[PDB]
Design a binder for this molecule. Structure first.
Ligand SMILES: [Ca+2]
Ligand SMILES: [Ca+2]
Lengths: 10, 139
């Protein structure tokens, strides 16, 4: 499990 | 200020021996951003997924209290997923990070196997949404 929750925009 | 009047239209039916998850849109959202709006996204995962491939997620739409996604996902876990529940995590994205709990819900595969679930779900808490599955017909 990686940082998917906080992985959308920069 | 805790008016949880937001509603989400989530559909989950069984077809082709797989789960057909379709998220239509949401209405009556409450501002969870400094700009006076909310831009949440749709996240769904069928546990247990240690492979990290059953975890589906979509990007946020834009500045509006009534966003529509119309995303259609179709997948299924091992035969031992009947006792599992489709976990939907609705969070308000804040560009760089997340920090606003909009609501969470789940649908049991065992119930969905004998009957498809489609309707408007209310904003429930983490435990409330993952332990229950009460959709509002609204029609
Ligand atoms: Ca926010
Ligand atoms: Ca936001």
């Amino acid at each position: 499990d990686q940082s998917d929750f906080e992985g959308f925009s920069y | 200020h805790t008016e949880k009047r937001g509603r989400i239209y989530l559909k989950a039916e069984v077809t082709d021996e797989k789960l057909h998850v379709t998220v239509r849109d949401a209405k009556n959202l409450i501002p969870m951003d400094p700009n006076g709006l909310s831009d949440p996204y749709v996240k769904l995962k069928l546990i247990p997924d240690p492979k990290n491939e059953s975890k589906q997620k979509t990007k946020t739409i834009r500045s509006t209290l009534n966003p529509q996604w119309n995303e259609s996902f179709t997948f299924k876990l091992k035969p031992s997923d009947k006792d599992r529940r489709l976990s939907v995590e609705i969070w308000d994205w804040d560009r760089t990070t997340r920090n606003d709990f909009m609501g969470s819900l789940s649908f049991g595969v065992s119930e969905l196997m004998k009957m498809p679930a489609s309707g408007w779900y209310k904003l429930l808490n983490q435990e409330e949404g993952e332990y229950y599955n009460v959709p509002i017909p609204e029609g």
